Symmetry: C3
Subunit: 275 residues, 3 copies
């Protein structure tokens, strides 16, 4: 009823500068209303924490500020479960969904999957029992498998498969840092973890038990080059080690063992053709 | 009231051939009834997706077809939670269980463990908070520990321990492929994953952080032989790597570090006696 | 109304010696009352399974005996969920908590996190969706992240971060063995597992995908020394491998790659400064 996107941004930015003095008791009506509207827009996918523009990933720090203010301005309250009881300050996404709205929005939520309000879930996606945190964006035709986690602000592309127990790391702070990004058509194998704003580019295949943050060496065995923070598009990636200079030990790394071209970006068939 | 096992099989097989034209709106009564009865039989353990015959694992593709048809013929509906709401087409196993039936069937379900209808849980097993998917068979005296997953169609033997965070991969497609099988008396260490129809034979001990699918080399260090798709009975298996030819890197594998005889198949004591 | 700590200990110890003959039907009133009071004291943090004295970890076997007797003396009962139903003998911690008590005790429980009664959660801690088992102690200012597990009897120190999917192994048996201990100010990276009474000392930083039980070699690369069962205070630990004598394969280990002094014990900054 009051604010468009630039207004929201300014209201959020101004409130964030003085956040030290904001409490759930004293937060003003305009700030609260603006924070509420931003969360609603994140929830619907109308706004998103990061987005790819001119084919590059841009991060909207102000949307992270809004999420952080939502924590500041809300008190924890008792949350009635059935067999369990909870105590938290972030509402759940589907509290007001009925059959018509679930049918309209076009995704499936398999119990006991849970999603916080402020996260967008696109049509044709399936949430097996899993967790999707505030600020996340999960695009169309994606599978989030059992005990997987989509962290705060994470951007999951279309036709992605997050296998069982896969975690995509949240990034609220630092404000300037891009969230963790899985681009379109990626497969992430079971028990893998991609964190700290690492970008896995389109059409990549990551096997089981692969852990990649900003400190993880991503070894291109064909060239000997080492990547950090980015899995180039079409990469097939498995766990490995690199030897020490003394030869007495080796340390964990990811290894790019195959590269698939744009015009072709079968999971088991790719992994078969190794060595 | 109508169909025995051969009839069910034919009804399922015939419906499956024409599945492209079957919707939740138009599915006929006989098909629906047959699909419902098959799910009930899978749920009770009276039928099972794979079984070991003349001491060999045989897969009943038609039971997978029935599970797949159950998805086709049922609409998603709103599923009321307490603090969360869901939207899915597969009912939960214990909806109609009372105290008498839980006492009769003889297992424990520790909250918030969840099991889909169409999965069999045998007596003396304990489900810590975990997930058991449709088509799975979990035999007697087994522990499914916290955040473990028993995937679709998976066969878990008697006296098995699935440690915390262990995933047993589902296999619905391809139809012909055996599901993931853990034979009797196996220990699977925390955070391990066994997928894609790999068979772990009786009395095996798999340590923590071991990931085995069809592409995973299982290195027998004693002989230099490489296994795929099968952990031979009595094997003690840990994570390792194999070196590249250039010596510049190594890649992930499982390693058989000890072999225990039939007449003897202590977990910490076995792992202690390494090197 | 009846028993202090030494009385409780004797009542528990005496009952434990004759536990073979104790059933939920025949358990006497005094034993039941004593077991109930011990669980209450564990729940409130007034008693704890292990504690550090004269700066050393001492284990109270009798508290484990009380937990074990609580299992013996209680029948499983139906536990009403909403969309799911359960069947177990251990009550949940927050059944009788209201807003005032949650505010007093000072922690947050994010749905669907679950905690069994008999576990202590200190103020300023956050339980993301996770599991905390009976007998555990979780001290102040700690984060238990999504799909993490704090096992039975585990002692988690102040200002600890248990990242996503981290498991801290339970230790009820053997009775004499210390539980798994994470000392104050430790960071444990995603998907890591610390089990079997391993002690991670103060100010340690464990990266992602690190698995440490009593059989895991902890390799100090600076000295060539191998540790078992203990991560010395201030250690920075990553996954690695050690080569075999034949050079044909390597096996999993943890590697201490950096050591931080007492007077200084940034996570990404530490891991950056490797090699």
């Amino acid at each position: 009823h009051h604010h468009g996107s630039q207004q929201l941004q300014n209201i959020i930015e101004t409130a964030f500068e003085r956040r030290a003095e904001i409490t759930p008791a004293n937060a003003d009506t305009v700030t609260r209303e603006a924070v509420n509207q931003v969360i609603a827009l994140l929830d619907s996918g109308a706004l998103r924490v990061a987005e790819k523009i001119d084919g590059q990933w841009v991060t909207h720090q102000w949307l992270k500020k809004a999420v952080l203010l939502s924590f500041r301005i809300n008190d924890n309250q008792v949350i009635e479960g059935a067999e369990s009881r909870y105590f938290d300050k972030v509402p759940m996404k589907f509290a007001d969904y009925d059959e018509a709205r679930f049918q309209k929005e076009g995704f499936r939520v398999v119990p006991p999957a849970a999603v916080r309000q402020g996260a967008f879930i696109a049509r044709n996606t399936v949430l097996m029992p899993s967790y999707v945190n505030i600020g996340a964006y999960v695009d169309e035709g994606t599978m989030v498998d059992t005990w997987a986690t989509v962290g705060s602000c994470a951007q999951i592309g279309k036709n992605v498969h997050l296998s069982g127990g896969v975690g995509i790391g949240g990034v609220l702070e630092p404000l300037q840092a891009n969230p963790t990004i899985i681009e379109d058509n990626c497969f992430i194998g079971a028990r893998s973890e991609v964190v700290e704003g690492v970008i896995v580019e389109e059409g990549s295949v990551i096997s089981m038990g692969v852990y990649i943050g900003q400190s993880t060496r991503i070894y291109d065995r064909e060239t000997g080059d080492i990547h950090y923070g980015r899995v180039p598009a079409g990469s097939v990636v498995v766990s490995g080690n690199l030897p020490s200079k003394d030869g007495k030990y080796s340390l964990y790394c990811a290894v790019i063992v195959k590269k698939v071209d744009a015009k072709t970006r079968g999971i088991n068939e790719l992994l078969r053709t190794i060595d």
